[PDB]
Coordinates of N, CA and C in Angstrom, one line a residue:
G1 N 11.2 -11.4 13.7 CA 9.9 -12.1 13.9 C 8.8 -11.5 13.1
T2 N 7.6 -12.2 13.1 CA 6.5 -11.7 12.4 C 5.4 -11.2 13.4
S3 N 5.7 -11.1 14.7 CA 4.6 -10.8 15.6 C 4.2 -9.4 15.6
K4 N 5.1 -8.5 15.6 CA 4.8 -7.1 15.5 C 4.1 -6.8 14.1
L5 N 4.5 -7.4 13.1 CA 3.9 -7.3 11.8 C 2.4 -7.7 11.8
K6 N 2.2 -8.9 12.4 CA 0.8 -9.3 12.5 C 0.0 -8.3 13.4
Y7 N 0.6 -7.8 14.4 CA -0.1 -6.8 15.2 C -0.5 -5.6 14.4
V8 N 0.4 -5.1 13.6 CA 0.1 -3.9 12.7 C -1.0 -4.2 11.8
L9 N -1.1 -5.4 11.3 CA -2.1 -5.9 10.3 C -3.4 -6.3 10.9
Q10 N -3.5 -6.4 12.2 CA -4.8 -6.8 12.8 C -5.9 -5.8 12.5
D11 N -7.0 -6.4 12.0 CA -8.2 -5.6 11.6 C -7.9 -4.4 10.7
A12 N -6.8 -4.6 9.9 CA -6.5 -3.5 8.9 C -7.4 -3.6 7.7
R13 N -7.3 -2.6 6.9 CA -7.8 -2.6 5.5 C -6.7 -2.5 4.6
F14 N -6.8 -3.1 3.4 CA -5.8 -3.3 2.4 C -6.2 -2.8 1.0
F15 N -5.4 -2.1 0.3 CA -5.7 -1.6 -1.0 C -4.5 -1.8 -1.9
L16 N -4.8 -2.4 -3.1 CA -3.9 -2.5 -4.2 C -3.6 -1.2 -4.8
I17 N -2.3 -0.8 -4.9 CA -1.9 0.5 -5.4 C -1.0 0.3 -6.6
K18 N -1.4 0.8 -7.7 CA -0.6 0.7 -9.0 C 0.3 1.9 -9.2
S19 N 1.5 1.7 -9.7 CA 2.3 2.8 -10.1 C 2.7 2.6 -11.6
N20 N 2.7 3.7 -12.3 CA 3.0 3.6 -13.8 C 4.5 3.3 -14.0
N21 N 5.3 3.5 -13.0 CA 6.8 3.4 -13.2 C 7.5 3.1 -11.9
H22 N 8.7 2.6 -12.0 CA 9.5 2.4 -10.8 C 9.9 3.6 -10.1
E23 N 10.1 4.7 -10.9 CA 10.6 6.0 -10.3 C 9.7 6.5 -9.2
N24 N 8.3 6.4 -9.4 CA 7.4 6.9 -8.4 C 7.4 6.0 -7.2
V25 N 7.6 4.7 -7.3 CA 7.8 3.9 -6.1 C 9.1 4.2 -5.4
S26 N 10.2 4.5 -6.1 CA 11.4 4.9 -5.5 C 11.2 6.2 -4.7
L27 N 10.5 7.2 -5.3 CA 10.3 8.4 -4.6 C 9.4 8.2 -3.3
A28 N 8.4 7.3 -3.5 CA 7.6 7.0 -2.3 C 8.4 6.3 -1.2
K29 N 9.3 5.4 -1.6 CA 10.1 4.8 -0.6 C 11.1 5.7 0.1
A30 N 11.6 6.7 -0.6 CA 12.6 7.7 -0.1 C 11.9 8.7 0.8
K31 N 10.7 9.2 0.4 CA 10.1 10.3 1.0 C 8.9 10.0 1.9
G32 N 8.4 8.7 1.9 CA 7.3 8.3 2.7 C 6.0 9.0 2.3
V33 N 5.7 9.1 1.0 CA 4.5 9.8 0.5 C 3.9 9.0 -0.7
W34 N 2.6 9.2 -0.9 CA 2.0 8.7 -2.1 C 0.8 9.6 -2.4
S35 N 0.5 9.8 -3.7 CA -0.6 10.5 -4.2 C -1.4 9.7 -5.2
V36 N -2.7 9.9 -5.1 CA -3.7 9.2 -6.0 C -4.6 10.1 -6.6
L37 N -5.4 9.7 -7.6 CA -6.4 10.5 -8.3 C -7.5 10.7 -7.3
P38 N -8.4 11.7 -7.6 CA -9.4 12.1 -6.6 C -10.4 10.9 -6.2
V39 N -10.7 10.1 -7.1 CA -11.6 9.0 -6.8 C -11.0 8.1 -5.7
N40 N -9.7 7.9 -5.8 CA -9.1 7.0 -4.8 C -8.7 7.8 -3.5
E41 N -8.4 9.1 -3.7 CA -8.1 10.0 -2.5 C -9.3 10.0 -1.5
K42 N -10.5 10.0 -2.1 CA -11.7 10.0 -1.2 C -11.8 8.6 -0.6
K43 N -11.7 7.5 -1.3 CA -11.7 6.2 -0.8 C -10.7 6.0 0.4
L44 N -9.5 6.5 0.2 CA -8.5 6.2 1.2 C -8.6 7.1 2.4
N45 N -9.1 8.4 2.2 CA -9.4 9.2 3.4 C -10.6 8.6 4.2
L46 N -11.6 8.1 3.5 CA -12.7 7.3 4.2 C -12.1 6.1 5.0
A47 N -11.2 5.4 4.3 CA -10.6 4.2 4.9 C -9.8 4.6 6.1
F48 N -9.0 5.6 6.0 CA -8.1 6.0 7.1 C -8.8 6.3 8.4
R49 N -10.0 6.9 8.3 CA -10.8 7.2 9.5 C -11.5 5.9 10.0
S50 N -11.6 4.9 9.2 CA -12.4 3.8 9.5 C -11.7 2.6 10.2
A51 N -10.4 2.5 10.2 CA -9.7 1.3 10.6 C -8.4 1.7 11.3
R52 N -7.9 0.8 12.2 CA -6.7 1.1 12.9 C -5.5 1.1 12.0
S53 N -5.5 0.4 10.9 CA -4.4 0.5 9.9 C -5.0 0.4 8.5
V54 N -4.5 1.2 7.6 CA -4.8 1.1 6.2 C -3.4 0.8 5.5
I55 N -3.4 -0.3 4.8 CA -2.2 -0.8 4.2 C -2.3 -0.7 2.7
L56 N -1.3 0.0 2.0 CA -1.2 0.1 0.6 C -0.2 -0.9 0.1
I57 N -0.6 -1.8 -0.8 CA 0.3 -2.8 -1.4 C 0.6 -2.4 -2.8
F58 N 1.9 -2.2 -3.1 CA 2.3 -1.5 -4.3 C 2.7 -2.4 -5.4
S59 N 2.3 -2.1 -6.6 CA 2.8 -2.9 -7.8 C 3.0 -2.0 -9.0
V60 N 4.2 -2.0 -9.5 CA 4.5 -1.3 -10.7 C 3.9 -2.0 -11.9
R61 N 3.2 -1.2 -12.7 CA 2.5 -1.8 -13.9 C 3.5 -2.5 -14.8
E62 N 3.1 -3.7 -15.2 CA 3.8 -4.6 -16.1 C 5.1 -5.2 -15.4
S63 N 5.3 -5.0 -14.1 CA 6.5 -5.5 -13.5 C 6.4 -7.0 -13.1
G64 N 5.2 -7.5 -13.0 CA 5.0 -8.9 -12.5 C 5.3 -9.1 -11.1
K65 N 5.3 -8.0 -10.3 CA 5.7 -8.1 -8.9 C 5.0 -7.0 -8.1
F66 N 4.9 -7.2 -6.8 CA 4.7 -6.2 -5.8 C 6.0 -5.7 -5.4
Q67 N 6.1 -4.4 -5.0 CA 7.4 -3.8 -4.6 C 7.4 -3.4 -3.1
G68 N 6.4 -3.8 -2.4 CA 6.4 -3.6 -0.9 C 5.0 -3.1 -0.5
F69 N 4.9 -2.8 0.8 CA 3.7 -2.3 1.3 C 4.0 -1.3 2.5
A70 N 3.0 -0.4 2.7 CA 3.2 0.7 3.6 C 1.8 1.0 4.3
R71 N 1.9 1.6 5.4 CA 0.7 2.0 6.2 C 0.5 3.5 6.1
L72 N -0.8 3.9 5.8 CA -1.1 5.3 5.9 C -0.9 5.8 7.3
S73 N -0.2 7.0 7.3 CA -0.1 7.7 8.6 C -0.8 9.0 8.7
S74 N -1.5 9.4 7.6 CA -2.3 10.6 7.6 C -3.3 10.5 6.5
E75 N -4.3 11.4 6.6 CA -5.2 11.7 5.4 C -4.4 12.5 4.4
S76 N -5.0 12.7 3.3 CA -4.3 13.5 2.2 C -4.2 15.0 2.6
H77 N -3.1 15.6 2.1 CA -2.9 17.0 2.4 C -2.2 17.7 1.2
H78 N -2.6 19.0 1.0 CA -2.1 19.7 -0.2 C -1.2 20.8 0.3
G79 N -0.4 21.3 -0.6 CA 0.5 22.5 -0.4 C 1.8 22.2 0.3
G80 N 2.2 21.0 0.6 CA 3.5 20.6 1.2 C 4.6 20.7 0.1
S81 N 5.7 20.2 0.5 CA 6.9 20.2 -0.4 C 6.4 19.4 -1.6
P82 N 6.6 19.9 -2.8 CA 6.1 19.2 -4.0 C 6.9 18.0 -4.3
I83 N 6.2 17.0 -4.8 CA 6.8 15.7 -5.2 C 6.9 15.6 -6.7
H84 N 8.1 15.3 -7.3 CA 8.3 15.3 -8.7 C 7.9 14.0 -9.3
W85 N 6.6 13.6 -9.2 CA 6.2 12.4 -9.8 C 6.4 12.4 -11.3
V86 N 6.6 11.2 -11.8 CA 6.7 11.0 -13.2 C 5.3 10.8 -13.8
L87 N 4.7 11.8 -14.3 CA 3.3 11.8 -14.7 C 3.3 11.1 -16.1
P88 N 2.2 10.4 -16.4 CA 2.1 9.8 -17.8 C 1.1 10.5 -18.6
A89 N 1.0 10.1 -19.9 CA 0.0 10.7 -20.9 C 0.1 12.2 -20.8
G90 N -1.1 12.9 -20.6 CA -1.1 14.3 -20.5 C -1.8 14.8 -19.2
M91 N -1.4 14.1 -18.1 CA -1.9 14.4 -16.8 C -1.0 15.4 -16.1
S92 N -1.6 16.3 -15.3 CA -0.9 17.4 -14.6 C -0.7 17.0 -13.1
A93 N 0.2 17.7 -12.5 CA 0.4 17.5 -11.0 C -0.9 17.8 -10.2
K94 N -1.8 18.7 -10.7 CA -3.0 19.0 -10.0 C -3.9 17.8 -9.9
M95 N -3.9 16.9 -10.9 CA -4.8 15.8 -11.0 C -4.5 14.8 -9.8
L96 N -3.2 14.8 -9.4 CA -2.9 13.9 -8.3 C -3.3 14.4 -6.9
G97 N -3.7 15.7 -6.8 CA -4.3 16.1 -5.6 C -3.4 16.0 -4.4
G98 N -4.0 15.5 -3.3 CA -3.3 15.5 -2.0 C -2.3 14.5 -1.9
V99 N -1.4 14.7 -0.9 CA -0.3 13.8 -0.5 C -0.7 13.0 0.7
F100 N -0.6 11.7 0.7 CA -0.7 10.9 1.9 C 0.7 10.6 2.4
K101 N 0.9 10.8 3.8 CA 2.1 10.3 4.4 C 2.0 8.8 4.7
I102 N 3.0 8.1 4.5 CA 3.0 6.6 4.7 C 4.3 6.2 5.4
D103 N 4.1 5.1 6.1 CA 5.3 4.4 6.8 C 5.4 3.1 6.2
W104 N 6.6 2.9 5.6 CA 6.9 1.6 4.9 C 6.9 0.5 6.0
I105 N 6.3 -0.6 5.6 CA 6.4 -1.8 6.5 C 7.3 -2.8 5.9
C106 N 7.3 -2.9 4.6 CA 8.2 -3.8 3.8 C 8.6 -3.1 2.5
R107 N 9.9 -3.0 2.3 CA 10.4 -2.4 1.0 C 10.9 -3.5 0.0
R108 N 10.7 -4.8 0.4 CA 11.1 -5.9 -0.4 C 10.0 -6.3 -1.4
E109 N 10.4 -6.9 -2.5 CA 9.5 -7.3 -3.6 C 9.0 -8.7 -3.3
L110 N 7.8 -9.0 -4.0 CA 7.2 -10.3 -4.0 C 6.7 -10.5 -5.5
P111 N 7.2 -11.6 -6.1 CA 6.7 -11.9 -7.5 C 5.3 -12.4 -7.4
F112 N 4.5 -12.0 -8.5 CA 3.1 -12.5 -8.6 C 3.0 -14.0 -8.6
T113 N 4.1 -14.7 -9.1 CA 4.0 -16.2 -9.0 C 3.9 -16.7 -7.6
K114 N 4.3 -16.0 -6.6 CA 4.2 -16.4 -5.2 C 2.9 -16.1 -4.6
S115 N 2.0 -15.3 -5.2 CA 0.7 -15.1 -4.6 C -0.4 -15.7 -5.4
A116 N -0.1 -16.7 -6.3 CA -1.1 -17.3 -7.2 C -2.2 -18.1 -6.4
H117 N -1.9 -18.4 -5.2 CA -2.9 -19.1 -4.4 C -3.9 -18.2 -3.6
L118 N -3.7 -16.9 -3.8 CA -4.6 -15.9 -3.0 C -5.5 -15.3 -4.0
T119 N -6.8 -15.4 -3.7 CA -7.9 -14.7 -4.4 C -8.6 -13.7 -3.6
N120 N -9.0 -12.6 -4.2 CA -9.6 -11.4 -3.6 C -11.1 -11.5 -3.7
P121 N -11.8 -11.8 -2.6 CA -13.3 -11.8 -2.7 C -13.9 -10.5 -3.2
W122 N -13.2 -9.3 -3.0 CA -13.8 -8.1 -3.5 C -13.5 -7.8 -4.9
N123 N -12.8 -8.6 -5.6 CA -12.7 -8.6 -7.1 C -13.0 -9.9 -7.7
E124 N -14.2 -10.4 -7.4 CA -14.7 -11.6 -8.0 C -13.8 -12.9 -7.8
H125 N -13.0 -12.9 -6.8 CA -12.1 -14.0 -6.4 C -11.1 -14.2 -7.5
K126 N -10.7 -13.2 -8.3 CA -9.6 -13.2 -9.1 C -8.3 -13.2 -8.3
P127 N -7.2 -13.6 -8.9 CA -5.9 -13.6 -8.1 C -5.7 -12.2 -7.6
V128 N -5.1 -12.1 -6.4 CA -5.0 -10.8 -5.7 C -4.1 -9.8 -6.5
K129 N -3.2 -10.3 -7.4 CA -2.5 -9.4 -8.3 C -3.4 -8.6 -9.2
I130 N -4.6 -9.1 -9.5 CA -5.5 -8.4 -10.5 C -6.3 -7.4 -9.8
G131 N -6.4 -6.2 -10.3 CA -7.2 -5.1 -9.7 C -6.9 -3.8 -10.3
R132 N -7.9 -2.9 -10.4 CA -7.6 -1.5 -10.7 C -6.9 -0.9 -9.6
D133 N -6.2 0.3 -9.9 CA -5.6 1.1 -8.9 C -6.6 1.4 -7.8
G134 N -6.4 1.1 -6.6 CA -7.3 1.4 -5.5 C -8.2 0.3 -5.1
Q135 N -8.1 -0.9 -5.8 CA -9.0 -2.0 -5.5 C -8.8 -2.5 -4.0
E136 N -9.8 -2.5 -3.2 CA -9.7 -3.0 -1.9 C -9.5 -4.5 -1.9
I137 N -8.6 -5.0 -1.0 CA -8.3 -6.4 -0.8 C -8.9 -6.8 0.6
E138 N -9.8 -7.8 0.6 CA -10.4 -8.3 1.8 C -9.4 -8.7 2.8
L139 N -9.7 -8.6 4.1 CA -8.8 -8.7 5.3 C -8.0 -10.0 5.2
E140 N -8.6 -11.2 5.1 CA -7.8 -12.4 5.1 C -6.8 -12.5 4.0
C141 N -7.3 -12.2 2.8 CA -6.4 -12.2 1.6 C -5.3 -11.2 1.7
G142 N -5.6 -10.0 2.2 CA -4.6 -9.0 2.3 C -3.6 -9.3 3.4
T143 N -4.0 -9.9 4.5 CA -3.1 -10.3 5.6 C -2.2 -11.4 5.1
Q144 N -2.7 -12.4 4.4 CA -1.8 -13.5 3.9 C -0.9 -13.0 2.8
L145 N -1.3 -12.1 2.0 CA -0.4 -11.5 1.0 C 0.7 -10.8 1.6
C146 N 0.5 -10.0 2.6 CA 1.5 -9.2 3.3 C 2.5 -10.2 4.0
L147 N 2.0 -11.3 4.5 CA 2.9 -12.2 5.2 C 3.7 -13.1 4.3
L148 N 3.4 -13.0 3.0 CA 4.3 -13.7 2.0 C 5.6 -13.0 1.7
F149 N 5.5 -11.7 1.9 CA 6.7 -10.9 1.5 C 7.9 -11.3 2.3
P150 N 9.1 -11.2 1.8 CA 10.3 -11.5 2.6 C 10.4 -10.5 3.8
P151 N 10.8 -10.9 4.9 CA 11.0 -10.0 6.1 C 12.0 -8.9 5.7
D152 N 11.7 -7.7 6.1 CA 12.5 -6.5 5.8 C 13.2 -6.2 7.1
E153 N 14.4 -6.6 7.3 CA 15.2 -6.4 8.6 C 15.5 -5.0 8.8
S154 N 15.4 -4.1 7.8 CA 15.8 -2.7 8.0 C 14.7 -1.9 8.7
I155 N 13.5 -2.5 8.9 CA 12.3 -1.7 9.4 C 12.0 -2.2 10.8
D156 N 11.9 -1.3 11.8 CA 11.5 -1.6 13.1 C 10.1 -1.1 13.3
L157 N 9.2 -2.1 13.5 CA 7.7 -1.7 13.6 C 7.3 -1.1 14.9
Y158 N 8.3 -0.9 15.9 CA 8.0 -0.3 17.1 C 7.4 1.1 17.0
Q159 N 8.0 1.9 16.1 CA 7.4 3.3 16.0 C 6.1 3.4 15.2
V160 N 5.9 2.4 14.3 CA 4.6 2.3 13.6 C 3.5 2.0 14.6
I161 N 3.8 1.0 15.5 CA 2.8 0.6 16.5 C 2.4 1.8 17.4
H162 N 3.3 2.7 17.7 CA 3.0 3.8 18.5 C 2.1 4.8 17.9
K163 N 2.0 4.8 16.5 CA 1.1 5.8 15.9 C -0.3 5.2 15.8
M164 N -0.5 4.0 16.2 CA -1.8 3.4 16.1 C -2.7 3.7 17.3

């Protein structure tokens, strides 16, 4: 059903999260972690304290799709088990800073063609697929976007609800 999903999304905040490659999303799906640059680390730490759920909606650059969405379960933290992210250009592992723990809510993909009717008020009402990494998605748009994804029968939201 969709009822526990709607409960998790109630009064949530939503952020568009870009990945340079599929490998980093695979790592994030296996290990339950994500790292962002400092400008977005501050935004997400602020958001994590501010709302009962912070939802990251993932899209691999140039893929034409979202690859799923996850809920922050922690603020960022340094010094844990290192994650072998595929860094681009000439960026170092230090630039990615802290690691957020995340609980996946949906690991299924959604093509951009299916969210063409959703516009994001916080990005000039452009289609919700459009946004820089870290762009916040307004509540109603983000909720409807998440509800478009195929149900992910492998995930039991019971344990997510207990962390709220």
